[PDB]
Amino acid sequence: LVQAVQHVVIGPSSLIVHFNEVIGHFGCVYHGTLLDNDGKKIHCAVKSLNVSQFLTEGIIMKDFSHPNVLSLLGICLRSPLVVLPYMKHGDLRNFIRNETHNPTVKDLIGFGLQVAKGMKYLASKKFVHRDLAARNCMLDEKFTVKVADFGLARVMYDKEYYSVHNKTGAKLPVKWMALESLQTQKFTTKSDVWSFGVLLWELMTRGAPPYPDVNTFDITVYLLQGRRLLQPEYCPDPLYEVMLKCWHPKAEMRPSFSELVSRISAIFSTF
Numbered sequence: 001l002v003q004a005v006q007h008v009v010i011g012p013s014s015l016i017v018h019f020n021e022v023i024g025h026f027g028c029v030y031h032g033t034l035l036d037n038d039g040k041k042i043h044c045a046v047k048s049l050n051v052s053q054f055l056t057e058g059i060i061m062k063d064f065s066h067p068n069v070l071s072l073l074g075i076c077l078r079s080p081l082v083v084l085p086y087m088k089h090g091d092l093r094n095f096i097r098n099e100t101h102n103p104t105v106k107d108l109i110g111f112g113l114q115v116a117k118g119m120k121y122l123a124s125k126k127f128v129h130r131d132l133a134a135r136n137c138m139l140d141e142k143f144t145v146k147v148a149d150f151g152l153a154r155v156m157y158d159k160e161y162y163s164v165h166n167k168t169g170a171k172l173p174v175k176w177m178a179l180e181s182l183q184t185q186k187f188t189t190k191s192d193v194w195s196f197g198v199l200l201w202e203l204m205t206r207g208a209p210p211y212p213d214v215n216t217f218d219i220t221v222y223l224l225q226g227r228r229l230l231q232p233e234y235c236p237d238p239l240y241e242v243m244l245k246c247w248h249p250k251a252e253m254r255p256s257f258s259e260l261v262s263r264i265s266a267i268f269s270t271f
């Protein structure tokens with residue numbers, strides 16, 4: 001493990017944490033400066049963790065290289081610190097909810113296509129996300145969407161959406177979970193497809209909360225009855241058909257991420 005983690009570990013002398021520049025219970029995010037031995041100084045975001053599994057997550061994230069997936073600059077051991085490239089426009093949900101922003105109907109479909117591309121890359125590597133949602137996607141200075149996971153850093157802020165299992169300790173985002181995951185607590189690439197369907201609905205409503213009139217406990221019965229999220233006012237009919245296929249009760253009937261990239265590219269560029 002020590003030899004395997006060598007390329008991910010950053011020395012404490014190489015990282016400058018700007019503690020008086022907070023970005024945002026389980027950890028704080030601050031502005032930072034990373035001192036690169038072979039290039040220019042890097043502006044970063046540093047997340048503090050208030051151990052063996054953590055370093056293996058570091059090795060997996062360091063192997064990611066795709067314009068639609070958040071990369072890892074490294075990990076600093078001394079509380080442990082996670083070093084990420086800085087994302088100028090924060091999370092995707094807060095960006096589209098901002099009343100001073102004017103994304104077009106095509107721009108919103110475009111953000112959906114970017115997520116599908118990042119997920120197609122992850123699924124080809126057999127990586128299961130388990131928490132795909134607009135709040136976990138980042139936006140850089142060039143408006144490029146980066147698929148990521150805050151982990152436990154926003155569970156208290158997003159307390160309305162998260163359940164924590166009393167036995168396994170698992171993070172459970174009930175209103176983004178596939179029917180079979182709510183019944184078995186098992187996650188697959190096909191249950192990530194269901195979550196992507198919910199993410200598309202969030203984009204086309206500019207960040208509205210899903211099922212606002214349905215109790216947490218009533219979600220399983222609501223879904224077994226065959227009921228689903230309603231078509232947003234400015235969501236095109238072919239894009240709603242895509243959402244409905246992502247929510248099929250049989251995991252095997254749901255489209256692959258390759259089929260999603262193809263259908264959304266058609267919707268995005270065709271009239």
Ligand SMILES: CCOc1ccn(-c2ccc(F)cc2)c(=O)c1C(=O)Nc1ccc(Oc2ccnc(N)c2Cl)c(F)c1
Nearest residue numbers: 029045047057058061082084085086087090147148149150
């Ligand atoms: C090493 C363990 O951590 C992981 C592990 C896996 N993945 C992961 C999981 C699935 C994927 F597909 C890809 C990556 C992660 O995303 C993280 C993580 O820590 N992400 C994280 C994200 C945003 C943060 O906040 C920022 C950052 C930059 N700019 C601004 N403005 C803000 Cl607010 C932040 F601090 C930390």
